[PDB]
Amino acid sequence: GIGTGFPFDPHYVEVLGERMHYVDVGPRDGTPVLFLHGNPTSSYVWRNIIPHVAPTHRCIAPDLIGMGKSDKPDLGYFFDDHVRFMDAFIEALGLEEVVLVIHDWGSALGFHWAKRNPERVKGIAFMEFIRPIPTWDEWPEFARETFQAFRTTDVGRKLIIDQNVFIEGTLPMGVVRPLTEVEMDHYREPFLNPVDREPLWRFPNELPIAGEPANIVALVEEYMDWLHQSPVPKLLFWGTPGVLIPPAEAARLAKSLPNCKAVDIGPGLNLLQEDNPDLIGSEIARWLSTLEI
Ligand SMILES: CN(C)c1ccc2c(-c3cc(C(=O)NCCOCCOCCCCCNS(=O)(=O)C(F)(F)F)ccc3C(=O)O)c3ccc(=[N+](C)C)cc-3oc2c1
Ligand SMILES: [Ca+2]
């Protein structure tokens, strides 16, 4: 069955006065592969992708500030906060050139960093990524009223912070196959205390949809503009019906973005790594062998 364990030794690095945890496996030389998770996950989401790549490539998978095994300071956990911390993480590890493997809010981080530092990004593998969604009619019908409620400070915080609905409900509803109790406990662990749930609520409130919030929409449009021109090698994974990326949008993107290969993973919602890790990991490994890295 799909693996439930997380066998990786913990590594920690001080970043802007805070400790961040990261996975670091694979050979020491060569261009490293930097895996960035999103909401509400951690490096745990990459646990069955990394073993396909770690035979021949260094794999680095941080836990975002406020998440996983990373420290959880009293921040607002705005996207800008995550940018500051991941900028500093990459610099703290002394990374030069990288290949990005990114998902959900990790893709916004990876795309925004790559747009700012294109000489250092030798390829981008991405899936269920942050795009400027033009209308709420593009959001999956079965989840529409709830995600609109999440974007308030009263019902939204009751649901996500007080009642933990993003972990107990939204997370399983973003995976086609059923998550085991062991897997659910791995996702629950960073967030046992309600006061640590701020990122879980701020991330859906940063989601750029129907023009709100305007500053995030502008930032995401900027990196999409870059992605539509840049020759950087691209690998897009998509599933059906998806959540952030409907299958029609994934097709359109695969045909419009330069130097892009697209892989249909089958059934999938948001956590594509939880529905077809074997294909995602094996296709990243094969694609990496075609890059000049
Ligand atoms: C076990 N089990 C399958 C479930 C399933 C459902 C529930 C529900 C429940 C949940 C929803 C609900 O979550 N609807 C929304 C689904 O959304 C799916 C698409 O997203 C997938 C992930 C996409 C992430 C994107 N990242 S991201 O946001 O940063 C950005 F920004 F997009 F990028 C809606 C209604 C209900 C309900 O039953 O009332 C509960 C509600 C309350 C509750 N109390 C204890 C009070 C417990 C619940 O127990 C459940 C367990
Ligand atoms: Ca080409």
Author numbering: 3 to 295
Publication passage describing the model:
The specific and covalent labeling of the protein HaloTag with fluorescent probes in living cells makes it a powerful tool for bioimaging. However, the irreversible attachment of the probe to HaloTag precludes imaging applications that require transient binding of the probe and comes with the risk of irreversible photobleaching. Here, we introduce exchangeable ligands for fluorescence labeling of HaloTag (xHTLs) that reversibly bind to HaloTag and that can be coupled to rhodamines of different colors. Here, we introduce exchangeable HaloTag Ligands (xHTLs) for the reversible fluorescence labeling of HaloTag7 with rhodamines, opening up new possibilities in bioimaging for a powerful labeling tool.
The binding mode of TMR-S5 and TMR-T5 to HaloTag7 was further studied through X-ray crystallography. The main difference resides in a reorientation of the residues L209 and I211 in order to accommodate the larger trifluoromethyl group in the active site. The L209/I211 conformational change induced by the TMR-T5 binding in the HaloTag7 active site allows a more favorable orientation of the sulfonamide group to form hydrogen bonds with active side residues than observed for TMR-S5; while the TMR-S5 nitrogen-sulfonamide forms a 3.3 Å hydrogen bond with the catalytic D106 carboxylic acid moiety, the corresponding hydrogen bond in bound TMR-T5 is only 2.7 Å. This difference in binding interactions might contribute to the higher affinity of T5-based probes than those of S5-based probes. TMR-linked PEG2-C5-methylsulfonamide (S5) was one of the compounds that presented a lower ΔGbind compared to regular TMR-CA (ΔΔGbind = −4.2 kcal/mol), which displays a KD < 1 μM.6 We synthesized S5 as well as a fluorinated triflamide derivative T5 in order to improve cell permeability and coupled both to fluorogenic rhodamine dyes−34 such as SiR35. The measured kon for these derivatives was above 106 M–1 s–1. Consequently, the koff for the bound probe can be estimated to be around 1 s–1. F/F0 measured for SiR-T5 (12.6 ± 4.0) upon HaloTag7 binding was comparable to the value measured for covalently bound SiR-Halo. The loss of the interaction of the (trifluoromethyl)sulfonamide of xHTLs with D106 resulted in up to 57-fold lower affinities of dHaloTag7 for these probes compared to HaloTag7.
